[PDB]
């Protein structure tokens, strides 16, 4: 379903539907994708639940990046911002952190 190509898009979705977000991610650099606060958990569990998974590359090189899957299920009607930042958790974000946003609109 959702990739970096969809940054800033609004997707129309049903309450209860699973949105798979797939984002490139390299843990060998210390960076990963996080909601504000440095957590993989939903800002608001009543609006939408989030599950999370890293998948390594089929490459055996050291420093080869993989993919984070975020499985988002909408739980209430509304247009919900899912806002991620690619950052080191001990540093936090800066002006120039890579950010990903998708809006999930359920009627």
């Amino acid at each position: 379903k959702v990739t970096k190509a969809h940054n800033g898009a609004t997707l129309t979705v049903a309450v209860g539907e699973l949105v798979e977000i797939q984002l490139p991610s390299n843990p060998t650099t210390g960076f990963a994708w996080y909601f504000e606060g440095g957590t993989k958990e939903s800002p608001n569990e009543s609006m939408f639940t989030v599950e999370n998974k890293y998948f390594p590359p089929d490459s055996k090189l050291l420093g080869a990046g993989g993919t984070e899957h975020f499985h988002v299920t909408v739980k209430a009607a509304g247009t919900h911002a899912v806002n991620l930042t690619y950052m080191r958790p001990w540093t936090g974000p800066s002006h120039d952190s890579e950010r990903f946003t998708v809006y999930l609109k359920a009627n």
Partner: protein, 241 residues
Amino acid sequence: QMNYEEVIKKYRGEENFDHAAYDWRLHSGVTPVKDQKNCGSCWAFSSIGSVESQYAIRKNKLITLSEQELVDCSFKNYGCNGGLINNAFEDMIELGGICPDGDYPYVSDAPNLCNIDRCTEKYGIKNYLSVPDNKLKEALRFLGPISISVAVSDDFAFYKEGIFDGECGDQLNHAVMLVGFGMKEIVNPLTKKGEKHYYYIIKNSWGQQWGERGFINIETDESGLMRKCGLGTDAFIPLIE
């Protein structure tokens, strides 16, 4: 081609050693922690660091060398998309050694072209040696810091201090440096007696605000045969003499 048993005979002899503790940070063997940033270049940082150590140790020369040149110029490796430790050392032999990073600075994943002539004098190696996985402590003691693989998870990114207690990655994924080993006696609150807790000391390339000023302690045992997270599955040491 280079035989570990033949090399160790030369550097150790019949000299015995304490398996509890030896830290190159205290014996002029470890140059400053650097930062790979957002770039899959740990293979270059690990292998360059180990060369930097040999110059400190064998030549009493503090030099900081260019990971960027290896990133740009190592055709066997894939720059910011990964590489191998042994491949890195092979390319250093082929390239005629490496520039100091003062003449060839690190620009991370910014586009950059290979230029093998940015300095008047390059720093090379003669060859590199594979360390057997059951000889890490001996190799450290007598040969120097070792470029190693480890399987890291996101728990690594949250490491602050002490002996690492997190999960392992699924697969070897990150090149680091083994710089020593240590032991801390901690009282078991049940038995009320001190117990010896052994660890390997690793230099990472995630900057000095990560972990213990850029370093991580990883559980081992007295022999050093305990290798958490596949540490030292690949283990290579460059030789400059």
